Ligand binder design. Structure first.
Ligand SMILES: *[C@@H]1O[C@H](CO)[C@@H](O[C@@H]2O[C@@H](CO)[C@@H](O)[C@@H](O)[C@@H]2NC(C)=O)[C@H](O)[C@@H]1NC(C)=O
Ligand SMILES: *[C@@H]1O[C@H](CO)[C@@H](O[C@@H]2O[C@@H](CO)[C@@H](O)[C@H](O)[C@H]2NC(C)=O)[C@H](O)[C@@H]1NC(C)=O
Ligand SMILES: O[C@@H]1[C@@H](O)[C@H](O)OC[C@H]1O
Length: 518
């Protein structure tokens, strides 16, 4: 395992994914913190195993351009063109990078592989360079020739190449963009979402790794949408995170703190987008915990410190169960100095808040505001789904699936139709409780006809049950999972004309890949 190849020659949406996917597979160390692949630690990789060679091809051939890609961060540190090797200046000469390609030219550019440098030398920004097959086809040709009196264009070219390989490896969002370039043969400029993903790749890894057990960030990471709207990410469980394919190595979870275990104070949103609230702001012992709209101010009765001891705290007091039986209510109570079992919860990344002593879960048996919460038998219903984080408004976007087609609401039915920007039926609200709702009808949910039946057609129905078939999780897999089922969302027989998205065991790839679009 050393050399992955890609060619432009008759390139398909499939073969670019196969290439990206193959590069992700060797860049993955077996480790998978919080469920997302991370890359190998530098002090762990011997110089011998420190590189992948990426062999790119072209029409105006005849030997390929080979990039040296560092397994540690997916940096393009050098590239070869026959006898000649070209290297990027570096802030800290690594033993490994020099000696990487012996028996070869060795020229070093006066610039680094960073974007600030490359843009500087290129004389334009990332948002001004077209991306796509033609741009890559020209970038490859220009890196083949490697004319040192040009150089402006060498640096431009590396911007094309790094974005279309390394960035795509890291994000399924940008991988999507290039697939759409190949399908429509239409070049594209990098939109502000793609630039923010590339800019915040390091931060996202840091946030995820240094998160508590449960995936809650200590600080949000600020991303962008297409159009320049701010996107705040507060946990691994945020649906946008599902497009984060592979992370930089930062640390290992619990001159270097292996990984901090913070105790963040966050809102907890769930059922119908409502918030876990200490009723009327009162903290007398035994006072109920309820559903209530999310306040976005800083009143203390909606803020919960998720402490390491497993308690969940608002003000000075602890989130507590009144008893260990199906139907018993959850309340505020004093935290004890031995710290009792009725006050310990695991808040799981999937969105369940479970009291370990009773194996019963935080539930909302009733969809309306002021409904008293409730430990219940875990059935992974949406009713029983939750999300830590201060940005509580449902993320609104397109769900792209098979053949880069978009889910579209059609009355009581959903199925994937060709993507088209004005939507509005194609817009989906990704709720805090795991449900997918049509933008223009937020009383209705993306629901299984029968969650017990494999092959059951998924419809749009009333959210009012808050059932098993109304919770969905966007997985690093790229699948949409049903917890409880173990089953995935699926386009029948990879055939969109059947108008049926169904519930099916994990295959095989393509007809079961989904991306909540950023
Ligand atoms: C919890 O939410 C609030 C913001 O709404 C933040 O906490 C506050 O910040 C300061 C102001 O001096 C500090 O004095 C607190 O101690 C204060 N309030 C309390 C008691 O929480 C904080 O940003 C947290 N939010 C995030 C981003 O996780
Ligand atoms: C994420 O979703 C899971 C549903 O399958 C929940 O439970 C965990 O799942 C088990 C098998 O996948 C098991 O390996 C786990 O240990 C179990 N929880 C624990 C800590 O015992 C829960 O939502 C999952 N856990 C995370 C990563 O939050
Ligand atoms: O909630 C508390 C806040 O009011 C203040 O900043 O003191 C510490 C915090 O935990």
């Amino acid at each position: 395992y050393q050399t992955v190849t890609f060619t432009t020659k008759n390139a398909t949406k499939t073969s670019y994914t196969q290439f990206i996917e193959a590069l992700r597979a060797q860049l993955a160390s077996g480790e998978e913190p919080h469920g997302i692949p991370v890359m190998r630690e530098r002090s762990t990789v011997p110089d011998s195993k420190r590189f992948i060679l990426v062999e790119l091809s072209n029409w105006a051939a005849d030997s390929p351009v080979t990039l040296a890609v560092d397994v540690t961060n997916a940096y393009v540190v050098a590239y070869r063109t026959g006898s000649q090797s070209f290297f990027l200046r570096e802030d800290n000469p690594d033993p490994a990078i020099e000696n990487l390609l012996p028996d070869t030219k060795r020229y070093t550019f006066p610039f680094s592989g960073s974007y600030t440098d490359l843009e500087r030398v290129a004389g334009e920004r990332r948002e001004e360079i077209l991306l796509g097959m033609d741009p890559l086809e020209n970038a490859i040709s220009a890196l083949w020739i490697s004319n040192l009196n040009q150089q402006r264009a060498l640096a431009r070219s590396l911007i094309v190449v790094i974005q279309m390989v390394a960035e795509a490896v890291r994000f399924r969002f940008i991988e999507y963009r290039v697939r759409e370039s190949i399908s429509r043969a239409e070049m594209f400029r990098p939109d502000p979402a793609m630039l923010s993903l590339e800019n915040k790749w390091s931060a996202l890894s840091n946030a995820v790794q240094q998160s508590n057990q449960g995936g809650v960030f200590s600080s949000p990471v600020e991303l962008r949408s297409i159009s320049n709207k701010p996107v705040y990410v507060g946990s691994v469980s945020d649906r946008v995170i599902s497009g984060l394919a592979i992370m930089l190595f930062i640390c290992r979870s619990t001159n270097d703190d292996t990984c901090a275990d913070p105790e963040p104070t966050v809102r907890i949103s769930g059922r119908n987008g409502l918030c876990v609230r200490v009723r009327d702001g009162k903290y007398n012992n035994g006072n109920p915990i309820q559903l209530w709209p999310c306040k976005q101010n800083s009143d203390v009765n909606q803020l919960w410190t998720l402490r390491r001891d497993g308690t969940i705290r608002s003000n000075g007091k602890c989130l507590t169960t009144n008893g260990y039986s199906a139907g018993d209510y959850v309340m505020i109570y004093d935290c004890r100095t031995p710290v009792t079992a009725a006050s310990i919860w695991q808040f799981w990344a999937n969105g369940t808040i479970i009291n370990p002593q009773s194996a019963l879960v935080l539930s909302a048996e009733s969809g309306n505001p002021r409904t008293t919460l409730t430990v219940q038998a875990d059935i992974y219903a949406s009713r029983q789904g939750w999300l830590a984080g201060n940005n509580t408004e449902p993320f609104v976007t397109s769900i792209v699936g098979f053949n880069d087609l978009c889910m579209q609401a059609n009355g009581d039915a959903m199925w994937v139709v060709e993507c088209e920007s004005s939507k509005a039926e194609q817009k989906w609200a990704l709720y805090p409780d795991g449900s997918i709702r049509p933008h223009q009808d937020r009383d209705r949910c993306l629901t299984s006809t029968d969650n017990h039946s494999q092959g059951s057609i998924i419809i749009i129905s009333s959210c009012s049950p808050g059932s098993e078939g109304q919770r969905w999780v966007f997985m690093n897999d790229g699948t949409i999972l049903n917890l409880k089922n173990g089953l995935v969302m699926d386009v029948k027989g990879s055939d969109p004309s059947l108008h049926q998205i169904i519930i099916w065991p994990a295959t095989g790839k393509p007809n079961q890949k989904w991306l909540p679009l950023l």
